[PDB]
Each structure stands twice: as structure tokens, then as C-alpha cells.
Amino acid sequence: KLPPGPTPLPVIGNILQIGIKDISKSLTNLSKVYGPVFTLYFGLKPIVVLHGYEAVKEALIDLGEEFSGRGIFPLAERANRGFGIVFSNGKKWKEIRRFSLMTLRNFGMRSIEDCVQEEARCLVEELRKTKASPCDPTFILGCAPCNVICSIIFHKRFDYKDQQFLNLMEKLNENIKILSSPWIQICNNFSPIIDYFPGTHNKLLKNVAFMKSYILEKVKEHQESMDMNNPQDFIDCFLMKMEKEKHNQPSEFTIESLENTAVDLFGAGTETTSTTLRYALLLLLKHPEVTAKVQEEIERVIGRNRSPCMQDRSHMPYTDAVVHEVQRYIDLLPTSLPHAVTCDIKFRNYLIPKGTTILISLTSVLHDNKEFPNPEMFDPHHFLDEGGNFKKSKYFMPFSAGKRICVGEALAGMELFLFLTSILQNFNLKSLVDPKNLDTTPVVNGFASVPPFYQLCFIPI
């Protein structure tokens, strides 16, 4: 029956072995005793944990349908985000996920690459407006992805210093901070707390309600300026599918599921790329040896004149490896989002019940020691053959794997490559703190490995 694991005390669960400051380390430590597959108690919730590449693959690729559910911790239950993609399950999941994926496979035409590449030219124009005086790249580096997303969801685009984008951005930023908070790790060993005590959980819920409301403005006002014969973004295409569905009659595609899908994409797309850029620049300040080898390639292959394009990546194996190494090293979502099993499933001779939540240690894979010697070192040679050519890796899965893999895997692949090479063709990065001195350590890591405060100067070439 349920796999091995430390015996959980009767209310607190296994909180005293896993702790609250650093879940993914503890999960790594417990695995060194209970093994690849074991069982924790977050209060009274059993959580099967999966550790090796071999255990993670077998579960998500090989029993892919049985592990393709979405485990719901509570905060998400009260946030009220079950319709649409991230937090939904079952049929509603599959219908909306295939639709959403289908409608992102194409933008009007304008290709998504043209959308990104233009946004990289607006980012460069705002790194120009800092007049090389030292800044915190947080709100600039967030506005680039956010714009790309806003263009896809509802067409519009924010001015980089628009006061309305600035709320949304810090609210997204604050929410991820809070979700990685120790206090939120106490809120999951005691789900009643969430409804009776005064803390940061209550603000996260406020902020979530805000974006939800904001998106719903946009979605109402899209319904009127309708025009079947002519839609021009995601929200329109979704409303068209709502009309193409009267045969189905009982929903699948409500406004409520639109409202939600739009906010899943808008938050996930902004904050996760945003955070990844921010840390990239942070790792480039820390390793100027690398930042140079990258800027050589850019000057050699792309000029200093024309926009970089995605065709450039195959002739830039250093820059391709650096971009991979950032995502591997930083380990943005150490334990992915939690899965759940859809039916009862016998797995590695154990038999887990329908519902049982599952954690994928993605750190366990990204920071594998065989596949990646000295995994805790940021080294772009982790992704380069002896020749000096890019080597792919089955162990590079920051977007997860299986049937619930990142819906935006490819869009994000582009946003990183194009925004980073656009910055580094036009700017030298001056750290205003000795590289020997700044630490690159996440300041918290519950949900997400969020980076430290830093500043830098964007000095043109």
C-alpha cells in the first residue's frame, strides 16, 4: 500500500522532519533514507514524493495519464481558481488545455516571434532611458514578458512605467514571495489556520482577487466589441468557441473558465519569465568570463544592428548553453506544481489511491550528479560537448514533463533567448557590487526560487 516514509505525529504530521524554511532540501535528505519514492504528511494529507529522474520519468511520461491530475493544496481552493488551465482537473482540463494550446499555436498574421522581437526593441529602448545610472531591473524586466502576454490575451500593451502595470507586477511579485514564505508552509500543515488567522495568506488572496477582477473588465469589454467574422486575440477566440458550443449546451467553456484561463496565462507567463530573466542578469554579473564569451558570439553571428531571431540560436551554442544553464541552476520551481493521481494506480509495487497528491522533485533531476557533474556550480559546459557544440539532455526539464508540461514552453524559450541577446548586444552590465561579493542564493524557495535584491548599470556599447 502507500510507500514508505517517516511516521507522522498525529496533528502536526511530518512537519518536524521536513521543516518549513526549505522543503526541497529536506525532500532530498529524506530520499537518502526512504529512497526514490516515499510518503510525507502535510498535517493529515499524504503526499507521495518522487525523486530520481527514473522515478519522475516513469510516473509522468510512462504512467502519464494516471499522473496527469492537479493536486490542490488549499490556498488555491479558496483563491477560487479551478476553472481554466493551471488548477483544473479532468475533462474541463483537457478541453481547455487543448483549445488554449491550439489557439497559441497561431497569432493573427504577425507571428509570435515578431511580437517578441518587437518587445525586445522596446525593452532595449527603456534600458536606454536609465541613462546608465544603476537600477533594480525588476519592473523593466517584468514588463517585457507581461507585454508579450497582454498582446496575446487581449491585444493591448502597457507603457513600461504605466502605474496600472506597476500594481499588477508587484502584486504578482508579492504573491510568489508569499507562496514561498515559511508562513505559507505552516498554512499547508494546518488548512484551518488559513481561515482564522491574520497573515500573509490573506493578502495573497486579496491580490489574486484583484487580477481576477482586472481580467474580467477586459473580458466583459471584449464581449461587446465582438464581431464573429473577426477576432484578434485569445479572449476573442475563446468567445467564438463559446458560440460554436450550443450543441454541447452544458458549458465546458463558460466565461468563468475564460476569466480563469486568461488569469492563469497572464500570471504564469509574466512572473515566471520575469523571475528567470532577473536571475539570469544576476548570474551574468557574477560571471563576467561567461558574459564575454556570450557577447563574442552575439557580435560574431548577429551584428550589433539587426534584431536577434530564433534561427540564430542554432549558430550560437554558447549562448544556447548559458540560457539552459540559468534555468537548470536556478531551479525556478523546485517541486513543480503538485500533481495528483487520477485513478488508483499500482506504481513501483505500491498502489496509491485516486486523489493522492504527488510531488515531483524537479531539483532532483535538474541537479542530478551523474548527468551534471558538480550540479551546484553554474557552469555552461554542463550543456556543451567536448567539441564546443550544444549537447541536449533528457535531464533538462524545468518546464516539467508529461501531459501537464508547461503550456508556454516554447514562448518562454523565445522570450529568454531574444530578450537576453537583445540586452547583451546593446549593453554591458556593470554590477555595482564586486562579483566576488554578491550572492545568488534564493532569498526563499517554497513554491519558487525567488532571487535576491541586486542592482546594475546598463552601459551601452
Contact pattern for ligand HEM over residues 89 through 118, marking x by CB under 6 A: --------x---------------------
Contact stretch for ligand HEM (CB under 6 A) within 120-128, 228-236, 246-254, 260-268? 260-268
Asked if residues 352 and 340 have their Cβ atoms less than 8 Å apart, the reply is no
CA distance 199 to 169: 21
- Would you say 132 or 405 has its CB closer to ligand HEM? 405
Q: Checking DSSP bridges between strand 45-50 and strand 357-360, what pairing results, if any?
A: parallel
Spatial neighbors of 123 by CB under 8 A, at least 6 apart, are: 140, 141, 143, 144, 419, 422, 423
Going by the DSSP 8-state scheme, the letter that residue 358 receives in this structure is E
| Residue list 177-196, contact with ligand LSN (CB under 6 A) | 179
CA nearest neighbour of 100 among 268, 258, 272 = 258
**Least Å distance between CB 104 and ligand HEM?**
7
**Least Å distance between CB 33 and ligand LSN?**
30
Under the criterion CB under 6 A, does residue 264 sit at the interface with ligand HEM? Answer: yes
| Residue of closest CB approach to ligand HEM | 408
- Choose among ligand HEM, ligand LSN, none what residue 75 binds, the Cβ cut-off being 5 to 8 Å by kind: ligand LSN
Contact pattern for ligand HEM over residues 321 through 360, marking x by CB under 6 A: -----------xx--xx-----------------------
CA quadruple 265, 157, 209, 331: dihedral sign: positive
> Kindly report the CA angle at 101 between 99 and 103, in degrees rounded to 5?
65
Under the criterion CB under 6 A, does residue 267 sit at the interface with ligand LSN? Answer: yes
Under the criterion CB under 6 A, does residue 211 sit at the interface with ligand LSN? Answer: yes
Spatial neighbors of 374 by CB under 8 A, at least 6 apart, are: none
- Choose among ligand HEM, ligand LSN, none what residue 76 binds, the Cβ cut-off being 5 to 8 Å by kind: ligand LSN
Asked if residues 158 and 150 have their Cβ atoms less than 8 Å apart, the reply is yes
Q: Which amino acid is at 436?
A: K
Under the criterion CB under 6 A, does residue 69 sit at the interface with ligand HEM? Answer: no
Under the criterion CB under 6 A, does residue 176 sit at the interface with ligand LSN? Answer: yes
Asked if residues 323 and 12 have their Cβ atoms less than 8 Å apart, the reply is no
Contact pattern for ligand HEM over residues 385 through 414, marking x by CB under 6 A: -------------xxx---x-xxx--xx--
Asked if residues 154 and 222 have their Cβ atoms less than 8 Å apart, the reply is yes
CA distance 41 to 366: 25
Going by the DSSP 8-state scheme, the letter that residue 345 receives in this structure is B
- Contact residues for ligand HEM, defined by CB under 6 A: 85-86, 97, 264-265, 268-269, 272-273, 276, 332-333, 336-337, 398-400, 404, 406-408, 411-412
> Which stretches of the chain bind ligand LSN, using CB under 6 A?
75-76, 79, 81, 86, 172, 175-176, 179, 204, 208, 211, 263, 267-268, 271-272, 333, 337, 448
